[PDB]
Structures are given as structure tokens and as C-alpha cells.
Design a protein around this motif. Structure first.
Motif, PDB file in Angstrom:
ATOM      1  N   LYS A  29       0.816  -1.210   0.000  1.00 19.31           N
ATOM      2  CA  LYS A  29       0.000   0.000   0.000  1.00 19.31           C
ATOM      3  C   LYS A  29       0.853   1.265   0.000  1.00 19.31           C
ATOM      4  N   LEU A  30       1.874   1.315   0.854  1.00 16.49           N
ATOM      5  CA  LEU A  30       2.714   2.510   0.955  1.00 16.49           C
ATOM      6  C   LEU A  30       3.526   2.850  -0.302  1.00 16.49           C
ATOM      7  N   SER A  51      -8.093   8.114   1.470  1.00 15.60           N
ATOM      8  CA  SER A  51      -7.580   6.749   1.428  1.00 15.60           C
ATOM      9  C   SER A  51      -8.367   5.886   0.452  1.00 15.60           C
ATOM     10  N   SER A  52      -9.674   6.128   0.336  1.00 12.14           N
ATOM     11  CA  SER A  52     -10.497   5.366  -0.594  1.00 12.14           C
ATOM     12  C   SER A  52     -10.173   5.704  -2.043  1.00 12.14           C
ATOM     13  N   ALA A  53      -9.702   6.925  -2.310  1.00  9.85           N
ATOM     14  CA  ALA A  53      -9.257   7.280  -3.655  1.00  9.85           C
ATOM     15  C   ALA A  53      -8.029   6.480  -4.065  1.00  9.85           C
ATOM     16  N   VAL A  54      -7.066   6.340  -3.152  1.00 10.07           N
ATOM     17  CA  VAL A  54      -5.871   5.553  -3.428  1.00 10.07           C
ATOM     18  C   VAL A  54      -6.222   4.074  -3.536  1.00 10.07           C
ATOM     19  N   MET A  55      -7.192   3.615  -2.738  1.00 11.29           N
ATOM     20  CA  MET A  55      -7.630   2.225  -2.830  1.00 11.29           C
ATOM     21  C   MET A  55      -8.335   1.936  -4.151  1.00 11.29           C
TER      22      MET A  55
END
Length: 100
Positions: A29-30, A51-55
Motif C-alpha cells: 500500500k505505501l 484513502s479510498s481514492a488511493v484504494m
DNA sequence: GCCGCCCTGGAGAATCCCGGTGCCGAGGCCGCTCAATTGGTCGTAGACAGCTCTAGCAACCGCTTAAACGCACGTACGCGCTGTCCCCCGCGTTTTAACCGCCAAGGGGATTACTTCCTAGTCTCCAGGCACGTGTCAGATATATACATCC
């Protein structure tokens, strides 16, 4: 230094059968967050990210890469090979219309 | 006569089963509450009818002519086999950073409520831009006729 070495290819078949059953993300993830932020600071500075955008970006990127690897494997099988090469990715993206 | 060794019986503790009681996930119930429902009114979107003109369609004709088709040959390329070497895979070992759990304050952004005003919808009237048709005009093209010349 132990005996009973495995044949080259059955271990890869075991990982094929393992990773096609599971559904988790195959990229950490990082590093993906760092890559997304590094790409996004070119378009605009001082960008915040949910965080949901990156997910969502990670889900879409992994699905795109898996589908491209399936087309690449079909390209490599068509050329009477079992090893994928960059020309297989290039042919798959050319037929898909990304390079066309 | 005194002391040491082998065989067998009943009481103390561990474990399985059952009943009473407390805690997690889910469903019934209640309360708010806002959006779906109901009822009425009205304008207009679309259905219907009617006339005119143009395209399509089934089945036939006739003529031309270029494309399609069949055939023979030949040779280039797909494919199979073999060698080789190199590069990717499997595995053992070491490192390292992802992951999770932490500050520390501050800003961004999602809501809830409220105020205000600018701007876009709506309506009426009008005029000019767009679509169509036509008279006219200058550039391009073809030939009529006269002059220099070879045999």
C-alpha cells in the motif's frame, strides 16, 4: 544444502493456482501511495488524497495489469513460447488500441 | 526368634455430563420526517386523418466487359528436428521496510441554517441572416484566317 529440489515450473503453477483463488491486492500500500502522490504532484501542487481514492486507484491499476498480463500471455502462447517478453506487451497494447 | 520381600484390597482425586445464568448478533417496535400519494386543473404532445411527391421493390429484359474462377506449375515459406547456451527459476541467507500502533496541531471539506442579489428563464415584438432562385460577368477553351517557309 538439502535434497529434493523442485522442477522449474510446478512452483510457478502453484503460485498461479494460489493467486487466482485469492482476491487481495498484490502491491504493497505505501509504495503505491508514494507513486500516486509523485505522479499527482506534476499535475497540481498541494494535493490531498482520501484513502479510498488511493484504494480505488490500486484496484483499477491491479485489474488493468492483470488483464494486460492475460493478453500478454496469450501473445506469448501464440508465438510458440511460454515466457512473456516486452514485445508481447507491446503487441497486446497495439491490438488493444493503446499504442494505436 | 528376628528381619526383609512379594501379592492384593478399599478409599482419595481427576474427568464427563447437565443445569442455571450472563453476553453478542439480529429482529420487532417506536419515533421523527420527508418524499411518495391523492385529488383537482389545465395546456399541449401526440395520435389521427388527408393530400402531394419521391424512393423502393419484385420480376423480367438487353448489352458490355471486367472480375471471378479453374487449372497448371513452381518455389518460397511454415513447420519439424537438433544443438547450444544463457538466462530465469528454485532455494538458502540476510536485510529492510511495510504494517500497526502512537503523538501534535492545524487546515480542508462535508453537513445545517440563513441571507441576498445577479442572472437566466419567460414573454413580446421585430428585423436580418440563412436558404433558395436567378441575371450577369470575367476567365478558360476552341477555331478562323493571315504571314513565313521547305521542297
Amino acid at each position: 544444502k538439502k535434497p529434493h529440489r523442485y522442477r522449474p515450473g510446478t512452483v510457478a503453477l502453484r503460485e498461479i493456482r494460489r493467486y487466482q483463488k485469492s482476491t487481495e491486492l498484490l502491491i504493497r500500500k505505501l509504495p503505491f501511495q508514494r507513486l500516486v502522490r509523485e505522479i499527482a504532484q506534476d499535475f497540481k501542487t498541494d494535493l490531498r488524497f482520501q484513502s479510498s481514492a488511493v484504494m480505488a486507484l490500486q484496484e483499477a491499476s491491479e485489474a488493468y495489469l492483470v488483464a494486460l498480463f492475460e493478453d500478454t500471455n496469450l501473445c506469448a502462447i501464440h508465438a510458440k513460447r511460454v515466457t512473456i517478453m516486452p514485445k508481447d506487451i507491446q503487441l497486446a497494447r497495439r491490438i488493444r488500441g493503446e499504442r494505436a
